C-alpha cells in the first residue's frame, strides 16, 4: 500500500506481521498433529524477521570509524567484530521477539527436521537480542551504576529464560548459545551435568580464565545440585564427586583422615544432647 | 564322561603345579581356560548350573580350587598395591580399573561358593571371606 513512510517506521511492520501470524495461527487449526501447511507459514515469517535482523547486523559490521570496529575499514575484514547491530533494546521490537520464541508451542507437534530448523532460527534471533543488550551495557559509564546493575539482572534473567526454553531443545545449540552471550555459564554447566559429558565441563574449564577457582566455588554453591557422585551413574567418576566437596564422612571417603579427626573431635565437643553419641 | 573327567584332573594338576611353583599369572590363565569357577558376577549362575554335571572326583577338589584361585587374586591385588608410585609413566586410571576387576572376581567366587549345592568345609568359607575383607 505504500512504503517510503513505513521505512522511516519499518519497526511497526514487524510487531504487526506477528499479530497477523497469530490471527493466521488462530485459523492454523494446529490443535495436534493434523495441521502441517499451517506450521510452514509460521516458519516463513520466522525466516524473514530473522534475515531482516541478519541485515541490520552486517550493516553494523560495515562501519566507517577507524576505532569502532577496525575490521571492514583500513584493517582486515576477515574477522568481523561483535555481530550485534548495536540496537538499544526497543520495548516493542524486543517484545515481538519474546513472543515468537513462545511460539515454541509448534515444536511440540511437528516433524523432526522442521522442529530443528525453527530451533536454529529462534537461536539465530536470540543471539541478536543478547548481543544488543551486551553492546548497550558495555557503553555504560561508572556513575549511575545502580541503573547499570539493574539492567544486568534484567538481561541475566532473560538469558536464564532463554535457557529453560532450550533445556527441552537440542544441547548441540547450547554450546553456541553459551558462547554467544559468552559467559552464561549456569546453563552450559547444567547441560554438562545432565549428560555424561564431563569432557565438556573440562573443555569449558580449559577455555576459561581461572576455571579451577570457579569450578570449585561452583561445586560448593551447587551443594547437592551438581558435582554429586550419586547423581551420575561406575568407576572413578563417582569417586570424583566426593572429592569435589570441600564433613567427616566425605573426608573418610576422600582419604583425608587427619581432616576427619579434627571435625570428629569438634563435633564431640559441641555434643551435649546425647552421652552415647 | 570318564574321559572328560580324566583330562580335567590332568589340567587341574598342571594348575596346582604352576600355583605351587609361584607362577601366579600362568596358574590364573589355566583356571580361566578351564571355566570351572566364575571370574565375573554374570557367569556365576551358568557355573552353578554346570557344577551339577561335574563328577564327584572334580567336586571333591572344588574347595582347594576356590582357595587357590582366591589366593591368586589376593596375590595379584597385593602386587598391584605394593607397586609403589615410582614408575613415572603408567596412567593411574588403568590401576583403579584393575583393582575394581580383581575385587569383582573375588566377589564372584564367594557368591559362587555360597550358591553351590555342595557343603564346603567351614574353614574354606572363612578363608575365602577373610581374603575378600583383606581386598576391600
Amino acid at each position: 500500500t505504500a512504503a517510503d513512510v513505513y521505512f522511516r517506521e519499518v519497526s511497526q511492520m514487524e510487531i504487526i506481521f506477528e499479530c497477523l501470524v497469530d490471527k493466521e495461527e488462530a485459523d492454523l487449526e494446529s490443535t495436534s498433529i493434523d495441521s502441517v501447511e499451517w506450521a510452514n507459514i509460521v516458519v516463513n515469517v520466522n525466516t524473514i524477521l530473522k534475515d531482516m535482523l541478519h541485515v541490520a547486523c552486517q550493516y553494523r559490521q560495515s562501519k566507517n570509524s577507524l576505532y569502532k570496529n577496525e575490521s571492514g575499514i583500513q584493517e582486515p575484514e576477515h574477522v568481523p567484530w561483535t555481530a550485534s547491530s548495536g540496537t538499544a533494546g526497543i520495548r516493542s521490537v524486543v517484545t515481538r521477539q519474546h513472543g515468537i520464541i513462545l511460539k515454541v508451542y509448534p515444536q511440540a507437534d511437528s516433524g523432526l527436521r522442521t522442529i530443528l530448523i525453527e530451533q536454529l532460527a529462534a537461536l539465530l534471533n536470540y543471539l541478536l537480542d543478547d548481543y544488543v543488550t551486551q553492546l548497550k551495557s558495555i557503553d555504560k559509564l561508572a556513575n549511575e551504576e545502580r541503573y547499570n546493575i539493574l539492567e544486568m539482572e534484567y538481561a541475566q534473567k532473560r538469558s536464564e529464560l532463554l535457557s529453560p526454553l532450550l533445556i527441552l531443545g537440542q544441547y548441540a545449540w547450547a554450546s553456541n548459545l553459551a558462547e554467544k552471550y559468552c559467559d552464561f555459564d549456569i546453563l552450559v554447566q547444567i547441560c554438562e551435568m545432565t549428560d555424561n559429558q564431563s569432557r565438556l565441563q573440562r573443555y569449558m574449564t580449559l577455555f576459561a580464565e581461572q576455571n579451577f577457582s570457579d569450578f570449585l566455588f561452583r561445586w560448593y554453591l551447587e551443594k547437592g545440585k551438581r558435582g554429586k557422585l550419586l547423581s551420575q551413574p561406575s568407576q572413578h567418576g563417582q569417586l570424583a564427586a566426593f572429592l569435589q566437596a570441600h564433613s567427616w564422612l566425605h573426608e573418610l571417603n576422600s582419604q583425608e583422615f587427619e581432616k576427619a579427626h579434627r571435625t570428629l573431635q569438634t563435633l564431640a565437643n559441641m555434643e551435649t544432647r546425647y552421652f552415647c553419641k | 564322561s570318564i574321559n572328560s573327567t580324566f583330562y580335567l584332573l590332568l589340567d587341574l594338576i598342571t594348575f596346582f603345579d604352576e600355583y605351587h611353583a609361584g607362577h601366579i599369572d600362568l596358574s590364573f590363565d589355566v583356571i580361566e581356560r578351564l571355566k570351572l569357577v566364575p571370574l565375573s558376577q554374570d557367569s556365576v549362575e551358568e557355573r552353578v548350573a554346570a557344577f551339577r554335571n561335574f563328577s564327584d572326583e572334580i567336586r571333591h577338589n572344588l574347595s582347594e580350587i576356590l582357595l587357590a584361585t582366591m589366593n591368586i587374586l589376593f596375590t595379584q591385588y597385593k602386587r598391584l598395591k605394593g607397586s609403589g608410585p615410582t614408575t613415572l609413566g603408567r596412567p593411574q586410571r588403568v590401576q583403579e580399573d584393575k583393582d575394581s576387576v580383581l575385587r569383582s572376581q573375588a566377589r564372584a567366587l564367594i557368591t559362587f561358593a555360597g550358591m553351590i549345592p555342595y557343603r564346603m568345609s567351614g574353614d574354606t568359607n572363612a578363608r575365602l571371606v577373610q581374603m575378600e575383607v583383606l581386598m576391600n
Partner: protein, 57 residues
Amino acid sequence: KQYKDCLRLADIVSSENQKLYTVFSKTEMRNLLQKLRESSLMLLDLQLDPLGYEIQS
C-alpha cells in the same frame, strides 16, 4: 546395611577395656579405616550424617 553399627566397631577397637588396637597390624588398621570410610559414604547416600545421625536441617 547396618552402616551405623559398622562405625561402632571403631569405639570397640579403640576401647581400653579389651585393648584390641594392640593386636592389629598397621596394614589391618589402615584396611579397617578404609572399610569404615566405605560404610560412612553409604550413610551419606542415605541422607544421614557421616556417623548415622539425622542431619539437623
